PDB file of C-alpha atoms and ligand atoms in Angstrom:
ATOM      1  CA  UNK C  26      -7.107 -20.071 -32.274  1.00  0.00           C
ATOM      2  CA  UNK C  27      -7.524 -16.750 -30.482  1.00  0.00           C
ATOM      3  CA  UNK C  28     -11.114 -16.323 -31.754  1.00  0.00           C
ATOM      4  CA  UNK C  29     -14.001 -18.561 -32.782  1.00  0.00           C
ATOM      5  CA  UNK C  30     -14.169 -19.287 -36.519  1.00  0.00           C
ATOM      6  CA  UNK C  31     -17.840 -18.286 -36.864  1.00  0.00           C
ATOM      7  CA  UNK C  32     -20.933 -20.158 -38.084  1.00  0.00           C
ATOM      8  CA  UNK C  33     -20.416 -21.951 -41.407  1.00  0.00           C
ATOM      9  CA  UNK C  34     -21.515 -20.193 -44.616  1.00  0.00           C
ATOM     10  CA  UNK C  35     -22.475 -17.122 -42.541  1.00  0.00           C
ATOM     11  CA  UNK C  36     -25.370 -19.178 -41.129  1.00  0.00           C
ATOM     12  CA  UNK C  37     -25.817 -17.335 -37.822  1.00  0.00           C
ATOM     13  CA  UNK C  38     -29.185 -15.725 -37.075  1.00  0.00           C
ATOM     14  CA  UNK C  39     -28.975 -11.899 -37.181  1.00  0.00           C
ATOM     15  CA  UNK C  40     -29.462 -10.187 -33.786  1.00  0.00           C
ATOM     16  CA  UNK C  41     -29.477  -6.596 -32.483  1.00  0.00           C
ATOM     17  CA  UNK C  42     -28.168  -4.461 -29.631  1.00  0.00           C
ATOM     18  CA  UNK C  43     -30.624  -1.530 -29.323  1.00  0.00           C
ATOM     19  CA  UNK C  44     -29.183   1.276 -27.200  1.00  0.00           C
ATOM     20  CA  UNK C  45     -32.508   2.851 -26.179  1.00  0.00           C
ATOM     21  CA  UNK C  46     -34.810   2.378 -23.204  1.00  0.00           C
ATOM     22  CA  UNK C  47     -36.082  -1.209 -23.052  1.00  0.00           C
ATOM     23  CA  UNK C  48     -39.794  -1.821 -22.338  1.00  0.00           C
ATOM     24  CA  UNK C  49     -41.135  -5.153 -21.058  1.00  0.00           C
ATOM     25  CA  UNK C  50     -43.331  -7.087 -23.504  1.00  0.00           C
ATOM     26  CA  UNK C  51     -44.384  -7.261 -27.114  1.00  0.00           C
ATOM     27  CA  UNK C  52     -46.402  -4.867 -29.219  1.00  0.00           C
ATOM     28  CA  UNK C  53     -49.664  -6.254 -30.623  1.00  0.00           C
ATOM     29  CA  UNK C  54     -51.178  -4.722 -33.762  1.00  0.00           C
ATOM     30  CA  UNK C  55     -54.686  -5.805 -34.900  1.00  0.00           C
ATOM     31  CA  UNK C  56     -55.902  -5.786 -38.492  1.00  0.00           C
ATOM     32  CA  UNK C  57     -59.253  -6.457 -40.153  1.00  0.00           C
ATOM     33  CA  UNK C  58     -59.885 -10.031 -41.265  1.00  0.00           C
ATOM     34  CA  UNK C  59     -63.215 -11.113 -42.743  1.00  0.00           C
ATOM     35  CA  UNK C  60     -65.571 -13.518 -40.949  1.00  0.00           C
ATOM     36  CA  UNK C  61     -65.498 -16.939 -42.704  1.00  0.00           C
ATOM     37  CA  UNK C  62     -62.658 -16.029 -45.116  1.00  0.00           C
ATOM     38  CA  UNK C  63     -60.808 -19.360 -45.096  1.00  0.00           C
ATOM     39  CA  UNK C  64     -58.508 -18.498 -47.984  1.00  0.00           C
ATOM     40  CA  UNK C  65     -56.767 -15.144 -47.494  1.00  0.00           C
ATOM     41  CA  UNK C  66     -54.734 -16.429 -44.554  1.00  0.00           C
ATOM     42  CA  UNK C  67     -53.500 -19.485 -46.528  1.00  0.00           C
ATOM     43  CA  UNK C  68     -51.035 -17.333 -48.490  1.00  0.00           C
ATOM     44  CA  UNK C  69     -47.442 -16.786 -47.275  1.00  0.00           C
ATOM     45  CA  UNK C  70     -47.324 -13.212 -48.570  1.00  0.00           C
ATOM     46  CA  UNK C  71     -50.454 -12.364 -46.597  1.00  0.00           C
ATOM     47  CA  UNK C  72     -49.070 -13.884 -43.352  1.00  0.00           C
ATOM     48  CA  UNK C  73     -45.623 -12.275 -43.759  1.00  0.00           C
ATOM     49  CA  UNK C  74     -46.756  -8.714 -44.602  1.00  0.00           C
ATOM     50  CA  UNK C  75     -50.034  -8.450 -46.607  1.00  0.00           C
ATOM     51  CA  UNK C  76     -52.044  -8.359 -43.376  1.00  0.00           C
ATOM     52  CA  UNK C  77     -50.907  -4.755 -42.921  1.00  0.00           C
ATOM     53  CA  UNK C  78     -52.608  -3.799 -46.241  1.00  0.00           C
ATOM     54  CA  UNK C  79     -55.980  -4.314 -44.542  1.00  0.00           C
ATOM     55  CA  UNK C  80     -57.443  -1.763 -42.141  1.00  0.00           C
ATOM     56  CA  UNK C  81     -55.475  -1.452 -38.874  1.00  0.00           C
ATOM     57  CA  UNK C  82     -57.907  -1.743 -35.982  1.00  0.00           C
ATOM     58  CA  UNK C  83     -55.700  -0.776 -33.044  1.00  0.00           C
ATOM     59  CA  UNK C  84     -52.738  -1.824 -30.939  1.00  0.00           C
ATOM     60  CA  UNK C  85     -51.694  -2.636 -27.396  1.00  0.00           C
ATOM     61  CA  UNK C  86     -48.130  -2.574 -26.074  1.00  0.00           C
ATOM     62  CA  UNK C  87     -46.218  -4.222 -23.273  1.00  0.00           C
ATOM     63  CA  UNK C  88     -47.634  -7.744 -23.631  1.00  0.00           C
ATOM     64  CA  UNK C  89     -45.691 -10.588 -21.993  1.00  0.00           C
ATOM     65  CA  UNK C  90     -48.577 -13.066 -21.752  1.00  0.00           C
ATOM     66  CA  UNK C  91     -48.873 -14.048 -25.445  1.00  0.00           C
ATOM     67  CA  UNK C  92     -50.692 -17.349 -26.023  1.00  0.00           C
ATOM     68  CA  UNK C  93     -54.091 -17.115 -27.654  1.00  0.00           C
ATOM     69  CA  UNK C  94     -57.105 -19.008 -26.246  1.00  0.00           C
ATOM     70  CA  UNK C  95     -60.404 -17.513 -27.389  1.00  0.00           C
ATOM     71  CA  UNK C  96     -63.725 -19.238 -26.711  1.00  0.00           C
ATOM     72  CA  UNK C  97     -67.046 -18.175 -28.219  1.00  0.00           C
ATOM     73  CA  UNK C  98     -70.037 -17.593 -25.905  1.00  0.00           C
ATOM     74  CA  UNK C  99     -72.739 -20.166 -25.312  1.00  0.00           C
ATOM     75  CA  UNK C 100     -76.029 -18.347 -24.670  1.00  0.00           C
ATOM     76  CA  UNK C 101     -77.528 -20.838 -22.264  1.00  0.00           C
ATOM     77  CA  UNK C 102     -80.349 -21.399 -19.805  1.00  0.00           C
ATOM     78  CA  UNK C 103     -78.144 -20.052 -17.013  1.00  0.00           C
ATOM     79  CA  UNK C 104     -76.612 -17.002 -18.754  1.00  0.00           C
ATOM     80  CA  UNK C 105     -73.890 -16.350 -21.330  1.00  0.00           C
ATOM     81  CA  UNK C 106     -70.578 -18.111 -20.681  1.00  0.00           C
ATOM     82  CA  UNK C 107     -67.488 -18.888 -22.807  1.00  0.00           C
ATOM     83  CA  UNK C 108     -67.497 -22.481 -24.087  1.00  0.00           C
ATOM     84  CA  UNK C 109     -64.193 -24.412 -24.201  1.00  0.00           C
ATOM     85  CA  UNK C 110     -64.086 -25.971 -27.700  1.00  0.00           C
ATOM     86  CA  UNK C 111     -63.624 -29.527 -26.395  1.00  0.00           C
ATOM     87  CA  UNK C 112     -66.838 -29.097 -24.356  1.00  0.00           C
ATOM     88  CA  UNK C 113     -68.899 -28.079 -27.433  1.00  0.00           C
ATOM     89  CA  UNK C 114     -71.225 -30.792 -28.744  1.00  0.00           C
ATOM     90  CA  UNK C 115     -74.229 -31.464 -30.973  1.00  0.00           C
ATOM     91  CA  UNK C 116     -75.805 -28.566 -32.851  1.00  0.00           C
ATOM     92  CA  UNK C 117     -74.973 -27.151 -30.371  1.00  0.00           C
ATOM     93  CA  UNK C 118     -74.530 -27.169 -26.602  1.00  0.00           C
ATOM     94  CA  UNK C 119     -71.670 -26.781 -24.142  1.00  0.00           C
ATOM     95  CA  UNK C 120     -71.088 -29.448 -21.474  1.00  0.00           C
ATOM     96  CA  UNK C 121     -72.437 -28.223 -18.150  1.00  0.00           C
ATOM     97  CA  UNK C 122     -74.590 -25.525 -19.832  1.00  0.00           C
ATOM     98  CA  UNK C 123     -77.131 -27.465 -21.960  1.00  0.00           C
ATOM     99  CA  UNK C 124     -78.155 -26.257 -25.463  1.00  0.00           C
ATOM    100  CA  UNK C 125     -76.780 -22.940 -26.724  1.00  0.00           C
ATOM    101  CA  UNK C 126     -79.217 -20.628 -28.518  1.00  0.00           C
ATOM    102  CA  UNK C 127     -76.637 -18.572 -30.439  1.00  0.00           C
ATOM    103  CA  UNK C 128     -74.892 -19.203 -33.754  1.00  0.00           C
ATOM    104  CA  UNK C 129     -71.307 -20.485 -33.844  1.00  0.00           C
ATOM    105  CA  UNK C 130     -70.892 -18.727 -37.166  1.00  0.00           C
ATOM    106  CA  UNK C 131     -71.339 -15.018 -36.422  1.00  0.00           C
ATOM    107  CA  UNK C 132     -68.826 -12.393 -35.275  1.00  0.00           C
ATOM    108  CA  UNK C 133     -68.424 -11.933 -31.490  1.00  0.00           C
ATOM    109  CA  UNK C 134     -66.888  -8.932 -29.713  1.00  0.00           C
ATOM    110  CA  UNK C 135     -64.604  -9.457 -26.733  1.00  0.00           C
ATOM    111  CA  UNK C 136     -61.528  -8.057 -24.964  1.00  0.00           C
ATOM    112  CA  UNK C 137     -60.044 -11.587 -24.691  1.00  0.00           C
ATOM    113  CA  UNK C 138     -57.101 -10.757 -26.954  1.00  0.00           C
ATOM    114  CA  UNK C 139     -54.835  -8.622 -24.778  1.00  0.00           C
ATOM    115  CA  UNK C 140     -57.647  -6.403 -23.462  1.00  0.00           C
ATOM    116  CA  UNK C 141     -58.273  -4.883 -26.904  1.00  0.00           C
ATOM    117  CA  UNK C 142     -61.986  -4.738 -27.776  1.00  0.00           C
ATOM    118  CA  UNK C 143     -62.386  -6.445 -31.135  1.00  0.00           C
ATOM    119  CA  UNK C 144     -63.783  -9.587 -32.843  1.00  0.00           C
ATOM    120  CA  UNK C 145     -61.573 -12.604 -31.936  1.00  0.00           C
ATOM    121  CA  UNK C 146     -63.744 -14.726 -34.259  1.00  0.00           C
ATOM    122  CA  UNK C 147     -62.321 -12.819 -37.209  1.00  0.00           C
ATOM    123  CA  UNK C 148     -59.124 -10.843 -36.934  1.00  0.00           C
ATOM    124  CA  UNK C 149     -55.420 -10.891 -37.731  1.00  0.00           C
ATOM    125  CA  UNK C 150     -52.820  -9.800 -35.207  1.00  0.00           C
ATOM    126  CA  UNK C 151     -49.079  -9.148 -35.345  1.00  0.00           C
ATOM    127  CA  UNK C 152     -46.898  -9.529 -32.236  1.00  0.00           C
ATOM    128  CA  UNK C 153     -43.467  -7.842 -32.482  1.00  0.00           C
ATOM    129  CA  UNK C 154     -40.660  -7.563 -29.938  1.00  0.00           C
ATOM    130  CA  UNK C 155     -37.159  -8.843 -29.178  1.00  0.00           C
ATOM    131  CA  UNK C 156     -36.413 -12.184 -27.551  1.00  0.00           C
ATOM    132  CA  UNK C 157     -33.491 -12.033 -25.091  1.00  0.00           C
ATOM    133  CA  UNK C 158     -31.857 -15.436 -24.553  1.00  0.00           C
ATOM    134  CA  UNK C 159     -30.435 -15.844 -21.084  1.00  0.00           C
ATOM    135  CA  UNK C 160     -28.424 -18.915 -22.229  1.00  0.00           C
ATOM    136  CA  UNK C 161     -26.459 -19.642 -25.411  1.00  0.00           C
ATOM    137  CA  UNK C 162     -27.671 -22.578 -27.498  1.00  0.00           C
ATOM    138  CA  UNK C 163     -30.560 -24.099 -29.384  1.00  0.00           C
ATOM    139  CA  UNK C 164     -34.079 -22.732 -28.677  1.00  0.00           C
ATOM    140  CA  UNK C 165     -37.130 -24.600 -29.972  1.00  0.00           C
ATOM    141  CA  UNK C 166     -40.266 -22.475 -30.395  1.00  0.00           C
ATOM    142  CA  UNK C 167     -43.584 -24.273 -30.834  1.00  0.00           C
ATOM    143  CA  UNK C 168     -47.265 -23.794 -31.409  1.00  0.00           C
ATOM    144  CA  UNK C 169     -49.136 -26.629 -29.596  1.00  0.00           C
ATOM    145  CA  UNK C 170     -51.931 -26.127 -32.135  1.00  0.00           C
ATOM    146  CA  UNK C 171     -53.010 -23.477 -34.673  1.00  0.00           C
ATOM    147  CA  UNK C 172     -56.619 -22.223 -35.034  1.00  0.00           C
ATOM    148  CA  UNK C 173     -56.668 -20.866 -37.691  1.00  0.00           C
ATOM    149  CA  UNK C 174     -53.367 -19.752 -39.273  1.00  0.00           C
ATOM    150  CA  UNK C 175     -50.079 -18.502 -37.806  1.00  0.00           C
ATOM    151  CA  UNK C 176     -46.372 -17.929 -38.413  1.00  0.00           C
ATOM    152  CA  UNK C 177     -43.467 -17.232 -36.060  1.00  0.00           C
ATOM    153  CA  UNK C 178     -40.241 -15.639 -37.355  1.00  0.00           C
ATOM    154  CA  UNK C 179     -37.036 -14.983 -35.412  1.00  0.00           C
ATOM    155  CA  UNK C 180     -34.043 -12.925 -36.480  1.00  0.00           C
ATOM    156  CA  UNK C 181     -32.997  -9.567 -37.899  1.00  0.00           C
ATOM    157  CA  UNK C 182     -34.215  -9.225 -41.516  1.00  0.00           C
ATOM    158  CA  UNK C 183     -36.555 -12.195 -40.957  1.00  0.00           C
ATOM    159  CA  UNK C 184     -38.903 -10.964 -38.187  1.00  0.00           C
ATOM    160  CA  UNK C 185     -38.137  -7.296 -38.880  1.00  0.00           C
ATOM    161  CA  UNK C 186     -35.058  -5.065 -39.095  1.00  0.00           C
ATOM    162  CA  UNK C 187     -32.978  -4.216 -36.009  1.00  0.00           C
ATOM    163  CA  UNK C 188     -34.003  -0.996 -34.207  1.00  0.00           C
ATOM    164  CA  UNK C 189     -36.982  -0.726 -36.598  1.00  0.00           C
ATOM    165  CA  UNK C 190     -39.631  -2.724 -34.673  1.00  0.00           C
ATOM    166  CA  UNK C 191     -42.393  -0.182 -35.472  1.00  0.00           C
ATOM    167  CA  UNK C 192     -41.892  -0.107 -39.242  1.00  0.00           C
ATOM    168  CA  UNK C 193     -44.260  -1.627 -41.859  1.00  0.00           C
ATOM    169  CA  UNK C 194     -43.598  -5.380 -42.076  1.00  0.00           C
ATOM    170  CA  UNK C 195     -40.698  -6.655 -44.151  1.00  0.00           C
ATOM    171  CA  UNK C 196     -41.412  -9.153 -46.897  1.00  0.00           C
ATOM    172  CA  UNK C 197     -39.403 -12.177 -45.681  1.00  0.00           C
ATOM    173  CA  UNK C 198     -41.271 -15.499 -45.888  1.00  0.00           C
ATOM    174  CA  UNK C 199     -38.433 -17.456 -44.245  1.00  0.00           C
ATOM    175  CA  UNK C 200     -40.591 -18.454 -41.271  1.00  0.00           C
ATOM    176  CA  UNK C 201     -39.205 -20.068 -38.155  1.00  0.00           C
ATOM    177  CA  UNK C 202     -42.563 -21.798 -37.715  1.00  0.00           C
ATOM    178  CA  UNK C 203     -44.847 -22.118 -40.681  1.00  0.00           C
ATOM    179  CA  UNK C 204     -48.331 -22.733 -39.231  1.00  0.00           C
ATOM    180  CA  UNK C 205     -50.125 -21.370 -42.297  1.00  0.00           C
ATOM    181  CA  UNK C 206     -53.522 -23.069 -42.782  1.00  0.00           C
ATOM    182  CA  UNK C 207     -53.187 -25.388 -45.790  1.00  0.00           C
ATOM    183  CA  UNK C 208     -55.471 -24.837 -48.785  1.00  0.00           C
ATOM    184  CA  UNK C 209     -56.175 -28.575 -48.560  1.00  0.00           C
ATOM    185  CA  UNK C 210     -57.147 -29.273 -44.938  1.00  0.00           C
ATOM    186  CA  UNK C 211     -54.177 -30.643 -43.011  1.00  0.00           C
ATOM    187  CA  UNK C 212     -51.919 -29.399 -40.198  1.00  0.00           C
ATOM    188  CA  UNK C 213     -50.403 -31.467 -37.364  1.00  0.00           C
ATOM    189  CA  UNK C 214     -50.086 -30.202 -33.801  1.00  0.00           C
ATOM    190  CA  UNK C 215     -46.869 -29.212 -32.065  1.00  0.00           C
ATOM    191  CA  UNK C 216     -45.345 -27.454 -35.059  1.00  0.00           C
ATOM    192  CA  UNK C 217     -41.872 -26.298 -34.135  1.00  0.00           C
ATOM    193  CA  UNK C 218     -38.864 -24.314 -35.303  1.00  0.00           C
ATOM    194  CA  UNK C 219     -35.358 -24.095 -33.850  1.00  0.00           C
ATOM    195  CA  UNK C 220     -32.991 -21.102 -33.654  1.00  0.00           C
ATOM    196  CA  UNK C 221     -29.416 -21.051 -32.270  1.00  0.00           C
ATOM    197  CA  UNK C 222     -29.107 -17.964 -30.106  1.00  0.00           C
ATOM    198  CA  UNK C 223     -26.282 -16.214 -28.239  1.00  0.00           C
ATOM    199  CA  UNK C 224     -27.043 -14.961 -24.715  1.00  0.00           C
ATOM    200  CA  UNK C 225     -27.444 -11.184 -24.254  1.00  0.00           C
ATOM    201  CA  UNK C 226     -28.269 -10.375 -27.889  1.00  0.00           C
ATOM    202  CA  UNK C 227     -31.777  -9.156 -28.762  1.00  0.00           C
ATOM    203  CA  UNK C 228     -33.460 -11.264 -31.479  1.00  0.00           C
ATOM    204  CA  UNK C 229     -36.358  -9.714 -33.464  1.00  0.00           C
ATOM    205  CA  UNK C 230     -39.459 -11.890 -32.981  1.00  0.00           C
ATOM    206  CA  UNK C 231     -42.695 -11.640 -34.983  1.00  0.00           C
ATOM    207  CA  UNK C 232     -45.836 -13.755 -34.555  1.00  0.00           C
ATOM    208  CA  UNK C 233     -48.717 -13.282 -37.034  1.00  0.00           C
ATOM    209  CA  UNK C 234     -51.963 -15.003 -36.116  1.00  0.00           C
ATOM    210  CA  UNK C 235     -55.371 -15.148 -37.841  1.00  0.00           C
ATOM    211  CA  UNK C 236     -58.849 -16.577 -37.187  1.00  0.00           C
ATOM    212  CA  UNK C 237     -61.847 -16.656 -39.565  1.00  0.00           C
ATOM    213  CA  UNK C 238     -64.535 -18.289 -37.395  1.00  0.00           C
ATOM    214  CA  UNK C 239     -65.477 -18.987 -33.798  1.00  0.00           C
ATOM    215  CA  UNK C 240     -62.699 -20.465 -31.640  1.00  0.00           C
ATOM    216  CA  UNK C 241     -59.115 -19.129 -31.909  1.00  0.00           C
ATOM    217  CA  UNK C 242     -56.115 -20.883 -30.330  1.00  0.00           C
ATOM    218  CA  UNK C 243     -52.349 -20.455 -30.466  1.00  0.00           C
ATOM    219  CA  UNK C 244     -50.485 -21.828 -27.451  1.00  0.00           C
ATOM    220  CA  UNK C 245     -46.909 -20.520 -27.741  1.00  0.00           C
ATOM    221  CA  UNK C 246     -43.889 -22.193 -26.048  1.00  0.00           C
ATOM    222  CA  UNK C 247     -40.110 -22.137 -26.172  1.00  0.00           C
ATOM    223  CA  UNK C 248     -37.775 -24.875 -24.970  1.00  0.00           C
ATOM    224  CA  UNK C 249     -34.502 -23.446 -23.578  1.00  0.00           C
ATOM    225  CA  UNK C 250     -31.011 -24.887 -24.187  1.00  0.00           C
ATOM    226  CA  UNK C 251     -31.246 -26.212 -20.596  1.00  0.00           C
ATOM    227  CA  UNK C 252     -34.304 -28.285 -21.576  1.00  0.00           C
ATOM    228  CA  UNK C 253     -36.879 -26.318 -19.597  1.00  0.00           C
ATOM    229  CA  UNK C 254     -40.007 -24.859 -21.221  1.00  0.00           C
ATOM    230  CA  UNK C 255     -41.524 -21.415 -21.025  1.00  0.00           C
ATOM    231  CA  UNK C 256     -45.195 -21.357 -22.083  1.00  0.00           C
ATOM    232  CA  UNK C 257     -47.655 -18.441 -22.491  1.00  0.00           C
ATOM    233  CA  UNK C 258     -45.953 -16.065 -20.085  1.00  0.00           C
ATOM    234  CA  UNK C 259     -42.701 -14.753 -21.662  1.00  0.00           C
ATOM    235  CA  UNK C 260     -42.039 -12.118 -18.995  1.00  0.00           C
ATOM    236  CA  UNK C 261     -38.288 -11.651 -18.751  1.00  0.00           C
ATOM    237  CA  UNK C 262     -37.762 -12.925 -22.330  1.00  0.00           C
ATOM    238  CA  UNK C 263     -39.545 -10.414 -24.570  1.00  0.00           C
ATOM    239  CA  UNK C 264     -38.990  -6.672 -24.823  1.00  0.00           C
ATOM    240  CA  UNK C 265     -39.778  -3.723 -27.065  1.00  0.00           C
ATOM    241  CA  UNK C 266     -37.724  -0.695 -28.130  1.00  0.00           C
ATOM    242  CA  UNK C 267     -38.961   2.488 -29.807  1.00  0.00           C
ATOM    243  CA  UNK C 268     -37.547   2.730 -33.351  1.00  0.00           C
ATOM    244  CA  UNK C 269     -34.110   4.265 -33.762  1.00  0.00           C
ATOM    245  CA  UNK C 270     -33.298   4.121 -37.441  1.00  0.00           C
ATOM    246  CA  UNK C 271     -30.182   6.219 -36.844  1.00  0.00           C
ATOM    247  CA  UNK C 272     -28.409   3.791 -34.465  1.00  0.00           C
ATOM    248  CA  UNK C 273     -25.740   2.695 -36.928  1.00  0.00           C
ATOM    249  CA  UNK C 274     -24.287  -0.178 -34.914  1.00  0.00           C
ATOM    250  CA  UNK C 275     -27.657  -1.741 -33.979  1.00  0.00           C
ATOM    251  CA  UNK C 276     -27.503  -4.747 -36.339  1.00  0.00           C
ATOM    252  CA  UNK C 277     -25.226  -7.677 -35.449  1.00  0.00           C
ATOM    253  CA  UNK C 278     -25.226  -9.929 -38.566  1.00  0.00           C
ATOM    254  CA  UNK C 279     -23.177 -12.605 -36.823  1.00  0.00           C
ATOM    255  CA  UNK C 280     -23.376 -12.812 -33.054  1.00  0.00           C
ATOM    256  CA  UNK C 281     -20.961 -15.792 -33.155  1.00  0.00           C
ATOM    257  CA  UNK C 282     -18.038 -13.437 -33.818  1.00  0.00           C
ATOM    258  CA  UNK C 283     -19.225 -10.100 -32.418  1.00  0.00           C
TER     259      UNK C 283
HETATM  260 CL1   CL D 306     -68.806 -15.241 -23.203  1.00  0.00          CL
HETATM  261 CL1   CL D 307     -74.709 -30.163 -21.032  1.00  0.00          CL
HETATM  262 GD1   GD D 308     -52.363 -16.398 -21.008  1.00  0.00          GD
HETATM  263 GD1   GD D 309     -53.223 -13.890 -18.126  1.00  0.00          GD
HETATM  264 GD1   GD D 310     -57.788 -15.993 -23.443  1.00  0.00          GD
HETATM  265 GD1   GD D 311     -57.172 -12.775 -22.395  1.00  0.00          GD
HETATM  266 GD1   GD D 312     -59.631 -15.933 -20.478  1.00  0.00          GD
HETATM  267 GD1   GD D 313     -56.040 -15.020 -20.432  1.00  0.00          GD
HETATM  268 GD1   GD D 314     -31.545  -6.335 -43.458  1.00  0.00          GD
HETATM  269 GD1   GD D 315     -61.307 -20.827 -35.769  1.00  0.00          GD
HETATM  270 GD1   GD D 316     -35.379 -31.547 -24.834  1.00  0.00          GD
HETATM  271 GD1   GD D 317     -54.438 -17.636 -18.188  1.00  0.00          GD
HETATM  272 GD1   GD D 318     -42.693   4.666 -31.027  1.00  0.00          GD
END
């Protein structure tokens, strides 16, 4: 009577209440990933944590604008311009630019991914932060498409451990969205994963994304309990906290009864 009974079979997603100074945005770490390696990123262990065993290239913090949309250059008669993938044709040209003289299959350097100078043709990145629901209820995260391989995980001990955002990745493969590139071809669009969330709790959020060749795409959305959709720009929803491994009360295993 007096209190709610709590989610059945302790099924609530673990959340956190970090006591430190909140910073807007997610942290992005970048790791080496080999041009044309179409197999490493097809393994769950790699996408959950193995990526951090490869050389770390760099990081940028405070990112609220998180969708990925990387276009290779077309070296054309009029200069070098990024080619939207749907405008690529033949062997090859880019609509409105004529024939492109450069290879689709080499590494290209760009600051497209969050202003960090790297090779978006071949890289793995890890986005970490906390999602703050403004409303209690069911949230549906989605990737509109995945080019090449990606996962999204939400929850304490699933994305990472509360108040330990900056630690080496945890080994959980219980993904909220599994957008891992299948060994055999495959992979529909609008892959989705739902999480029930309680307003005002901070939910660890990890996205791991990888590309082996040319174009890279990962359009990230969330549908709120109120049926509206937030896409690309998660300002106001995603935050970072410096690690505090000594904050004893930081983990809230069951927000339904806290
Ligand atoms: Cl370009
Ligand atoms: Cl053309
Ligand atoms: Gd964007
Ligand atoms: Gd932007
Ligand atoms: Gd972009
Ligand atoms: Gd960009
Ligand atoms: Gd851009
Ligand atoms: Gd952009
Ligand atoms: Gd844990
Ligand atoms: Gd690609
Ligand atoms: Gd809906
Ligand atoms: Gd944009
Ligand atoms: Gd730190």
